[PDB]
Amino acid sequence: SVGQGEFGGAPFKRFLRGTRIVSGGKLKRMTREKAKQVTVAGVPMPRDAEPRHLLVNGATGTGKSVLLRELAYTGLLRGDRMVIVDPNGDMLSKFGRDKDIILNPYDQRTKGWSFFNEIRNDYDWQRYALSVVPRGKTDEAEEWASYGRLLLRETAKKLALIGTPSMRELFHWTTIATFDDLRGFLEGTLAESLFAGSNEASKALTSARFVLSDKLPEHVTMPDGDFSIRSWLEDPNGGNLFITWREDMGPALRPLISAWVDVVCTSILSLPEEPKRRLWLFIDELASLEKLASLADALTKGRKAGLRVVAGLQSTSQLDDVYGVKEAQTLRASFRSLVVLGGSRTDPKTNEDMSLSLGEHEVERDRERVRERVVMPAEIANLPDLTAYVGFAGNRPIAKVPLEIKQFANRQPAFVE
Amino acid sequence: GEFGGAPFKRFLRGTRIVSGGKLKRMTREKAKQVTVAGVPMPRDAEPRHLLVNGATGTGKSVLLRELAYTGLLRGDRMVIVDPNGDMLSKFGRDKDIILNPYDQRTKGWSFFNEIRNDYDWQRYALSVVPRGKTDEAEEWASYGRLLLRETAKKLALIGTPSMRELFHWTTIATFDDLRGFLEGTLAESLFAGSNEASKALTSARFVLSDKLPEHVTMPDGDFSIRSWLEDPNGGNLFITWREDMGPALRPLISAWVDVVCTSILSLPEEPKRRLWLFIDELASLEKLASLADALTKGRKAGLRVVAGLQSTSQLDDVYGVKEAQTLRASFRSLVVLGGSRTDPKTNEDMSLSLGEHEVERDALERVRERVVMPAEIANLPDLTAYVGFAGNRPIAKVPLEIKQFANRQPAFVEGT
Amino acid sequence: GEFGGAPFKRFLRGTRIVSGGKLKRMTREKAKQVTVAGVPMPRDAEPRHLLVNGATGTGKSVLLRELAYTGLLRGDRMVIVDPNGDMLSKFGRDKDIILNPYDQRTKGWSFFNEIRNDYDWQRYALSVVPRGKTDEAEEWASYGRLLLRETAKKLALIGTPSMRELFHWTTIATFDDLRGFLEGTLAESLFAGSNEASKALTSARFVLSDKLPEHVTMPDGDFSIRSWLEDPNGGNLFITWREDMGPALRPLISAWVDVVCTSILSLPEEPKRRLWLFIDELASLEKLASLADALTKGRKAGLRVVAGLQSTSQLDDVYGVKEAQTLRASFRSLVVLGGSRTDPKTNEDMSLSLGEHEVERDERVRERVVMPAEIANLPDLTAYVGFAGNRPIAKVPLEIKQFANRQPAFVEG
Amino acid sequence: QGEFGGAPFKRFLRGTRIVSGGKLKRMTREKAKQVTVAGVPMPRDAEPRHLLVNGATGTGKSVLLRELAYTGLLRGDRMVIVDPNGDMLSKFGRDKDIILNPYDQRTKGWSFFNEIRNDYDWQRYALSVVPRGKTDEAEEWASYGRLLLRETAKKLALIGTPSMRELFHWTTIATFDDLRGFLEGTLAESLFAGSNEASKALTSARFVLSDKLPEHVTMPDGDFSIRSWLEDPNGGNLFITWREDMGPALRPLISAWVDVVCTSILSLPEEPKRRLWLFIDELASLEKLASLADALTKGRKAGLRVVAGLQSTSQLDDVYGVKEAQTLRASFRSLVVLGGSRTDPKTNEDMSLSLGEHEVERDRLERVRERVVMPAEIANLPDLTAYVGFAGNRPIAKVPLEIKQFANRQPAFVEG
Ligand SMILES: Nc1ncnc2c1ncn2[C@@H]1O[C@H](COP(=O)(O)OP(=O)(O)O)[C@@H](O)[C@H]1O
Ligand SMILES: Nc1ncnc2c1ncn2[C@@H]1O[C@H](COP(=O)(O)OP(=O)(O)O)[C@@H](O)[C@H]1O
Ligand SMILES: Nc1ncnc2c1ncn2[C@@H]1O[C@H](COP(=O)(O)OP(=O)(O)O)[C@@H](O)[C@H]1O
């Protein structure tokens, strides 16, 4: 019959509707195209599906990193540019060249940077204050955040105005200077009266201080330079951007890395009309960053810029806890292509989500009409590592493909200094 | 033949699916009509509104552009929430209007220009300061509107209806000075006498400091959306903006769209009027205070709203579940463009929205089943849509053709 | 016979569906009746109320206008929450009353006109200041009512029952002056002695500053909805307003409707009374403090409420799920006009409301008499009528009857 | 069937597969030395994927963990054991081994100061001393506490007096003003001053530290460092013991030590041959660990192997919160189900669903989807009986847990 070596369930006589499952080789051939393509677990990825983004969901130790490394690699062979959120500088040590850029406050090779370097028009202040101070986890936390951005944008605006665009100065005024002195320095800015006149006003200012005291730190200790992610995006000859950090400092650099990633997100929306552009945004673990203020729009309006986002994810519960259910749903829905690497059996909810995501099919069998999941939650829970279900965006069948561990020579040190 | 599931002997009840061509025949009418994915739209369904739901990159924009186009051929007027001035560069004429604080061709505007009676102050304060996301956020908003309407009312009274002055008093003037300026207005005592009163005033300041900005930097003029709606000879209104400034202009655009919404409710009795409101992405605007009534009482004015939507979770996050449900329920005609497989919930909603049918198959058996499975919606290729017009009509899976339109005008003209 | 699903051999239990004509025969009665979509309504079902649920543009208004009309032919009195004065321009007579602060024909009114005993102050303060949407909003509301009832009580006492004065003291007079004016009232100490006390007073001010406005600008007069209810010779009450001012008049209209609700509970023992309360859109009013009791204890007063409704999600957002459920449950008779397909939840609720039936075929089957999809495919002016009690439902066509405009809808003051 | 509790079947299609105890033992047996889970040799590759042992009180979690620990010691692996009543200590404790217990005479001297090596380490371990708050508001306080803790400790260390006593005095005894004074010069200088909110925040911090610090202060002094210990191969095993009646009192201290191990392993140098086990008898009895998650996800390089006991899923939920607890559980690839109480059908359902369903073909042919293990089957398990489901593509098996006897080669507690 049908559904053998392809469909895990009982073979069937006729397929009616729903999700189609096909053999690995059959998909590879089916999705193969004329132009140069990149590969997902050895499956050539449909060109049109690239800017629709890819979400790679999988339990810890199943191959998300292998998969993303292979994707990045084949992308480089095609000569595409990319920004890689790279933990421990792994990708850097493998594909990093000399013309490439490194952003890491603790690596000797890092460029010098400050969010000031991205300001070009007045609307840019709030725009990037949104990157420095990501969205709050809760409504109340976001209210504080907003106060923090008000304080940040007005204080930075003035410092820049009087010719001293210093993060050190910015940090001093917003978190060290006494309450009165700050209010004084604010006189003349839109924040002049907003932060005064009532207890509420003072409370709000106090909230702002705390927020900025939490976010700014790593921004301040960042080696200075005139590097601009915006300019870098415009320079074709510019290389690839590697955002690296050592795992033990992950929580410390969370707000800085979340800022850089967000900067790339809003910034691509300003790049000039250029069809030939192809920019990949590799995010190893979407849930480990903060609630990004621009990721959503980037995933929705980045087609013109040729933005291609690929993000790894372990539990759907993570993204939920970071963005919130409603918001997280929208975020996920923005990634048209999906890859399921099989999760843990101690987490049946995710296995169910992934199973449901893969979809059901209506089939005609012998002895008749049946609706069933093409991939059972249990099937996903039993997947061996380095094995994945690939479901490209649009009207294409999914397939269970083996992920091969390709070896890459270390053509550069991961960390220096 | 057109039903994706197993063929059946007899149809009993529920949603009925028909072939693209068969629906086109069915919905075809004598009078001039507009088209939805190449399907002539029933005249009576136009003022019942249309909701176009679809994943990013599936064709919502193509569909809305085609609708707008055929609408223009019929000579109808329209207000288009137009991103990057795309629609503007294609169908924009010289008699047409442009609202964009950064485009040189923009008209000059201030919400003052819409005030005609006393009840109009709160009415449009409701537009300048949209509804709060949360109950607490709305409470602040209300304080903001109180502060806004009373301060503007006085400014207008003393003959200085300036947004600059309004912005100065409500966000720059010291607390005391403001209280002073308020003396004589209904807001005189409301914002004084206790900590709570002061807190409320502080809340109002913040809100207005968030909304007003783009209103202030807006080029001044005497253009009035109200007057414009009344002038038959007036053209079409194009609300444009550059994507990178979307978040910055969110509160301003949300104001203009809302202004159109309440304002049509005052237009004089005119059956021949046909006004379309094209909203590319309903969830990208703020919680509109008047959208609901407009979608419910705009029939007399001949209001026809068409809105794009990606995830139902968005609208929910903006208006709130209960409220978003009511909003969606106000759009009688639906179009489903197929979403992502990473979001099975929406696919389920869309599937359920398209409905089930009870059928008799093969002696015989009775079966209830979704006419379109969630999976079927998740597998739709781009530019393919299910069209389900309001009322008792079958749905159909139709191909969306990408029509080409000559750029008869620049999308943006840097205002210097 | 007449059902949408597969025909069956035998009916076992559950909701039973019948043909339009068959129901018309079944519900027809000896006495004069009113009609619901051309179906004579059982007399006993009248005071059990009717809820007409239906998508925008399906015929709720047509249906209510017909009901009102046949009700007038029978000579019943009624209060009509009438948008744009549509019902007024059609069935409005000269002996009839009009309440609209902006219409020249409006009577003069103030809630003072309803006060007759001491318990009436809070009673109508509950009408002027409807229930809060959220618990916190209601807490403020309560402070507002305290401030409202005590200030009004004193103004009436010293002989100056003025809404203008009431509004001045409660929202314009400085904090201290107000406290001063309160001295002697129960509100004397309640609003003083701590920050909390002061905060509460501030809350009250805001609330009244939101509700009172339209009450103040209302043309003064001595008209009393209470008295009007008692006067048999009184006409019908038309509560009208222009749609563009709907949000502005929301709190005032909500007050009048509520006043009618509590007031009917005081009318004297009169079996022959028949008073209809037509509410075009129940969800467009505020959370009415007395609607519930009216729908439950209005029989002896002969109260008959008919309300229109679009989405169940609306009522929920206004009264809250639990409360909204109780409200809806109070309407024994239901009419379903078919909704939009973009809202499958309501279609499901309406389908479930219409009920299932157990039937014998071919063989035992339980199924919805009306599928959610069937309700989503109803063409306009088509409705399912399910009268209260043990009666079958029926799918009936709603005819658009034409009514001559025997009076202007609005007459600018 | 002999392995499957339900009706025997003709053919297996997909899903979870169940096999006999002996058959799994054969299947998972490997060439190298392995450790055992209820007598079943554990796949080497599954070790660093962690193991979650769920089971009702009195079913065998402790027996199972003791056996695992034992066979692990025979292979010569190092381990950190959260050991109640020093049970594991009295059985496998040697002389080269370490003991952390403020009330045991054999304890090493410790202070979190001993773990600081770089500047980013202050917050890093402040996160260990002050675990995550149960609720969002509780965590906000906690964060203030960490700010106060890290800045005060940083200064104390700076001026040469890294004393927990001094730290505790300044943060919870010194008058408000004096503290603010001592803070002058630190990042916390202005943060905790200038408004009521600021003062409120400081008050919150005080309370938090006053709750956590206590046991840290009364801890015998020393220069022992869990970080250094991890680096010393010749170091022994770490036994974290405490007497049950003092469990609640030592909760925040034990939670700090376990967390310290969690972040610290992330700094250990590149060493493939390392094998470090983290035995946590009851995961829900600790606080919301700030580093457990990363440890369970990035500890492979370090060779971290975590084994945790758990009674009700409702516990973990109450501690970490549903979303977070789900992620936590999901990080343990291998599962062991010891059967719970019938008074708790929810957990039995979760465990049943976790074990998974299978699609099978049976002779009346018929296709059936069913749970391999019914909730009722789990509720009827006799003690010392467990379902073993190793990570990856391996069948589960119902195996008997044997109570092995271990000689008491050392006293469990030695009062000080
Ligand atoms: N350089 C390598 N050599 C051998 N196996 C590797 C290598 N990198 C990754 N793997 C395999 O991939 C598995 C999962 O780790 P990884 O691929 O990084 O994905 P994850 O994102 O789930 O951590 C490892 O358990 C191992 O089997
Ligand atoms: N001018 C065009 N040229 C080619 N393809 C187009 C054009 N406009 C739209 N499309 C097609 O329509 C798809 C959907 O994008 P769009 O029409 O903007 O709708 P959506 O609102 O879903 O983003 C694009 O991926 C592309 O394939
Ligand atoms: N006087 C009329 N002339 C023509 N059509 C009318 C008239 N009144 C009502 N209708 C019809 O009735 C439908 C319902 O409008 P209405 O009766 O106001 O109810 P509702 O708006 O509550 O659904 C319209 O779709 C139209 O088909």
Ligand SMILES: Nc1ncnc2c1ncn2[C@@H]1O[C@H](COP(=O)(O)OP(=O)(O)O)[C@@H](O)[C@H]1O
């Ligand atoms: N030293 C022992 N001697 C006899 N039985 C024991 C011993 N230790 C454990 N057991 C058995 O194991 C059961 C479960 O207790 P335990 O192994 O501590 O697990 P848990 O408390 O985690 O469920 C006991 O009821 C007993 O039957």
Ligand SMILES: [Mg+2]
């Ligand atoms: Mg990884």
Ligand SMILES: [Mg+2]
């Ligand atoms: Mg679009």
Ligand SMILES: [Mg+2]
């Ligand atoms: Mg109506």
Ligand SMILES: [Mg+2]
């Ligand atoms: Mg135990």
